[PDB]
Symmetry: C2
Subunit: 503 residues, 2 copies
Amino acid sequence: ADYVLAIDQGTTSSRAIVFDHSGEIYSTGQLEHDQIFPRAGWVEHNPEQIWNNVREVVGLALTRGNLTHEDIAAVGITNQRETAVVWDKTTGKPVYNAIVWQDTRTQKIVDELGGDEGAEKYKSIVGLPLATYFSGPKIKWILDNVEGAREKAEKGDLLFGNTDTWVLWNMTGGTEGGVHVTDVTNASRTMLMDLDTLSWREDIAADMGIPLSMLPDIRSSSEVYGHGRPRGLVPGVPIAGILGDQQAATFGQACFEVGQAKNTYGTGNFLLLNTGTEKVMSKNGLLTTVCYKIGDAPAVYALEGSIAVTGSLVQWLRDNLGMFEDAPDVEWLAGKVQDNGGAYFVPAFSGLFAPYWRPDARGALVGLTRYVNRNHIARAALEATAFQSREVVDAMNADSGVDLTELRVDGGMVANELLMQFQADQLGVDVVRPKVAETTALGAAYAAGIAVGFWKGEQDVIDNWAEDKRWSPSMESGERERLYRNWKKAVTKTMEWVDEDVE
Amino acid sequence: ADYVLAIDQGTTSSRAIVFDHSGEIYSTGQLEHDQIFPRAGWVEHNPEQIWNNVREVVGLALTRGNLTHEDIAAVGITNQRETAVVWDKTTGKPVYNAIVWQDTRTQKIVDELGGDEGAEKYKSIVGLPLATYFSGPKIKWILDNVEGAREKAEKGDLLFGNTDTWVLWNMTGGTEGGVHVTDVTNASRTMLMDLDTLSWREDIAADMGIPLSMLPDIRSSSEVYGHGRPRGLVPGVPIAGILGDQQAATFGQACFEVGQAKNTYGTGNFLLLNTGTEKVMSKNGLLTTVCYKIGDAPAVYALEGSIAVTGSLVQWLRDNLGMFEDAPDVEWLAGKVQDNGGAYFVPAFSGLFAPYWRPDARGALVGLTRYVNRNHIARAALEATAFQSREVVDAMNADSGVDLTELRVDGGMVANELLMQFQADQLGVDVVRPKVAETTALGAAYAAGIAVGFWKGEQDVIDNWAEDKRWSPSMESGERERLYRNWKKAVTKTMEWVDEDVE
């Protein structure tokens, strides 16, 4: 077997990618699944469509690469986190659609669960605030809303799973031999797992009215969970790796050492920092979570931060204000000027931490003078993505003493030299861009190949890890701080106006 | 004679307009003159070109209307203010070009003139801060920098005068009989006139090194100053009206009552409030000026306010940010939505008053959210012109206790019904636009006409004043005030950020 097959079961689509020992793409296949909105704030996925699509991309990837299951040494799985699936273990049929992490129907349940200020109720144990994103409250919604579900869960007839678990169950035979398992990274996103013991917590489960029988067996992120069902496309093939999507991209970037972090650039940004075997609890409102766990080796933990508006800023300037209608890539406008021209963008929800720690939907644009033009505005818009990233990094550093040693990056925006160099300048550490952009799928492959010996372990992966390039800090140190301070000041004053803003 | 000829000697062109008893435009003539920039910040006009242009337009207006000096009952003159002309009274040739109000070369002179007392040194006597705009310091410049000027002056052969004086002198014969006179509105713009007594200040003149022999005799704004020279276009005709442009505009809007004010909408805005016979000194930085004086009658005063960025805002958003390249008229985009969507513009130099009275070049745009689009921005942009006029109105109220009774408007933006309505809504008083848009010229006509009896007086002018349209406040008090205080908070917060913005 010369290849490892990764399945990335994402939010909007699912793809299979076949990798070789070097970490290079051999063949791929991809399909979208429906985003279902039964009503406002509700976001659902049809679980069967997800399975049949996954079934199909695998076939697609093999066919394109002229491969046979005989060529696959292992299958790795990565998935959109938090999305909740509840199905019958006997009929195999879901009792309701998968409730996506984007869904907000559980706001009320989340508010009752916490009680008059209780969002932080479970943080010390599970590392998460009570929010609409996480699985637990979603399972509770399914048990309080669906006819009969709770009684059958009581009986032990219902299974819960993130889609890693849903995909794994179907790939091992479903109602015939299906294994009900999840890894530590995905379990850390449900609100039910104790970060220290890596086990389900009975008290939190009871609090949410969730029978323990619905919960899958928590295992590591790298070990043989099972084998491809006999009559499928990957008959006999070991399925030996699972990592939540962001943890997988982190793993595919080879952020194996303390201080290494991965920043993903999209409409919004996600940043995870490897804090080693030491678990760090945030004082800045950040998430604590599991980065990965390779078999019997100790779990490696992480701090996770998110930024609501990064790449979507420039997209809003275009679709809402009608700017840049002439230029597709804004980088080429920002490059026509030397500076932000005194302009600063206070993106919405940028007021993450100080002085209030209360992100708001209202943003601003300050420092406009007669000289300022759209090239400056393009420049400042890119800077705000970097500034926000820096403020999440400073929060992480303040919480650990594990200071970001370097940033590895993925996402569409990693193709912007200006942004990337400025990101390095602002952070004062190197910024590395991998040669393979699908870090999410690559992480799932590394996790699975390690478990079966296709790769010998973490060090061997580093040896086969190739980078595209890296940017090193070069900006005048004084200019580096001036920009950052003026920006944090802008954020502050903007939040002050917002408090007194009577809408 | 059934007509009154008005000469409007402006910043970029000069025009002649012939009106009849009903205030209608019968015939007109207009010609541009060169805007000379010998140096950065230097702005000059060729006094000879201006004079030639004035004769030619007068000729044009008379010819096109088929009128002769016999049909002209009187001539009125209005002119761009503060611009200074210094000429040889024996040859009638300028010693230098006219230095325009927009010329900033007098900054050093102005800085040192104030000594330890500063810019407000003379404010309590003349109504004006020391600044590059005003005539005094410009006359000093010419004397200190031009050869033979200082001595010719000491002989009594040098004359000064704004363009009103410069035109009246030539019109009455120049070297051969020219009269050297100015009215009180223009005199009050040079910094050398006492507001209470309406006379030249012997001490201020010496402070600036200006012999009193250079200064024109000060008269009222409406009386016969002399008659057109025999070889001219208007031989024997009384020249009986002079008002500085903004005052002319105000007079031509028939703003004859305490509390009536006129707002001129341009790239920037000029607002004047009639304060009656009581001179009011501002505690808000506004200017104190003579509105007009009609013969023996007591002089009427005004408070004057200037707003730097009004019409420029939309221009900037288009020429610099590349927005609205689709809409030459933004009123059509603003009309697609019913409100600003939460957005507020804090235009550069909008911090005219509290908290600091320290206008700054740096502005901002706040209250941005995902749903705000260019339609909201367009409306917010317009709202900002209305808001800044309201704060100038408030500062005028806080200075005198004279409630604005009604706002008369001119300038390019009065075609915008959306803006004029909102303006009425914000001021809570009626906003009216005249049928005759050329208010400055009409104002000069009224003054001259009254001096010769073509009109009986101010009530008679009112009896002939033509009104086009009027807007009544229609916005609920809650919405009205909420929008305004929200904007004022935006201006405040912006100024605070600007104070800590290290650029």
